[PDB]
């Protein structure tokens, strides 16, 4: 338990995912969802992803001045489905917590598959 504290911050990422998929702090998501509505009102297209990474990145700098220091922005991304472009465009957008190495020891495949479902409601 002390090697994660020196290098990886394992249980710090337990508190961290609650702010995004469980929506702990609302200012990260309200300044998101304000900027996210002019894109969700139109149906999704092929060109839907490249603006959503830019609208994610300019939403996390209007609310932060110290969050560049941890290793959380590189372990969260935008997750989107395979739904055909004839939808309303609101249900395609979701955020997911990415894992690469020793964080994937405590996070297997079954964890974030359930976190998609608790996110959509």
């Amino acid at each position: 338990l002390d090697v994660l504290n020196k290098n990886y911050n394992l249980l710090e990422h337990m508190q961290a995912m609650r702010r995004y998929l469980l929506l702990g702090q609302g200012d990260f998501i309200r300044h998101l969802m304000d900027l996210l509505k002019p894109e969700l009102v139109r149906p999704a297209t092929t060109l839907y992803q490249h603006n959503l990474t830019g609208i994610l990145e300019t939403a996390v700098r209007a609310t932060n001045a110290q969050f560049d220091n941890p290793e959380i922005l590189k372990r969260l991304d935008v997750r989107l489905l395979e739904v055909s472009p004839g939808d309303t465009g609101w249900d395609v957008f979701s955020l997911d917590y990415h894992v690469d190495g020793p964080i994937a020891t405590v996070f297997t495949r079954e964890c974030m598959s359930h976190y998609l479902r608790v996110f959509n409601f």
Binding site: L23, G24, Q25, G26, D27, R30, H31, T63, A65, Q66
Partner: protein
Amino acid sequence: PREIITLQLGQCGNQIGFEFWKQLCAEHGISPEGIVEEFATEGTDRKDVFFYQADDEHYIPRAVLLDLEPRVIHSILNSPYANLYNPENIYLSEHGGGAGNNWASGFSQGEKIHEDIFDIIDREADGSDSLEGFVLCHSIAGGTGSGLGSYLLERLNDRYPKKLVQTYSVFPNQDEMSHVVVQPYNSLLTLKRLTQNADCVVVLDNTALNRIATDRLHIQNPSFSQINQLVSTIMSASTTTLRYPGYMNNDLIGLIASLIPTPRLHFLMTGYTPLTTDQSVASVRKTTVLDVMRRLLQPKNVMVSTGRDRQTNHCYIAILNIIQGEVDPTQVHKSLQRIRERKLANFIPWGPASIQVALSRKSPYLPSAHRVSGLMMANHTNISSLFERTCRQYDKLRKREAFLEQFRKEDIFKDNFDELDNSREIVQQLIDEYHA
């Protein structure tokens, strides 16, 4: 993002907003001229919601202060908190005004300085591309805050139509009528603009201030230096979901949306218990949340002069109970469990009611992270007793031939007195009709 521009105006509105900004630096861990503590970002997760966003880690206040009297601003620059204020956003040195004491003075001065009053206050509007709204931190007492404040409630309604308007306005004192006598005239003229030209207000009575100022504060000679202490805490208490990181109703359009039943019914009753410093020695033994909201609905902390025997035929519709800091949230649902058993709030028989409770962590400070705080934002239909008090003092004065010849020489040609009387009775009749 969620930037609000405060409109501090008048003789009393400038002093209650002066210590409101002075309260914000002690809880953000910042100094008005520098940054000496690192507690501003690790302890507080959001600071750019009332301040202007930083250029050198200097959080400029988004404030404007206009008044006809230069006495309120000359007691500012010698204080060491005025260097945080800017001498180019509002006025430079040696700013003045009228002579001056009239409601028709500031009502006529709005269209002669019309070019300058809509020039420098609009420079802060386009700083953020998503403006929250405008709060008019003005006064009703006197002719300074009531005369000019009625003009900006009209021209900002159409030039900025998609913005929230809601004010923390203070009510004047009705004890004797010797020093001022124009009090029933300038109050009802602004009170009409507060209902149809304004969405919401936050009432703050003056006769209820000295009820609390001699309750636990123990003063013998009531001075004006105590009027800023009850007011500046509940102002910063109302934005604890907005300044500090909260989740639900974390915007000013979040809180006001869940309490207003209808337009022209927006007068919210305020309550705030903890104001005593010797309570601190016994809060070390885990003073809980189960006892702090039993006294909010009990009429002891109220700042509204209302009848004591008029609460049986009146019904609460919306009641807010804000806990701050240490909450112990495993018993906050336990505190809301005990609400239905007493029925201390009379419920409306036509529709449902709501007791909304919310929490947010306070400042990293020892008097703040130790003592429980309870902020109340009630909405009870006994508020027509103040409207019956102001109207009975209004029609009695017009039969005594008082200020009918001394008031209509400047910019008043027709009798607009019953235009305020019927619209006030429209509010008083729709309140009692609202519970069918």
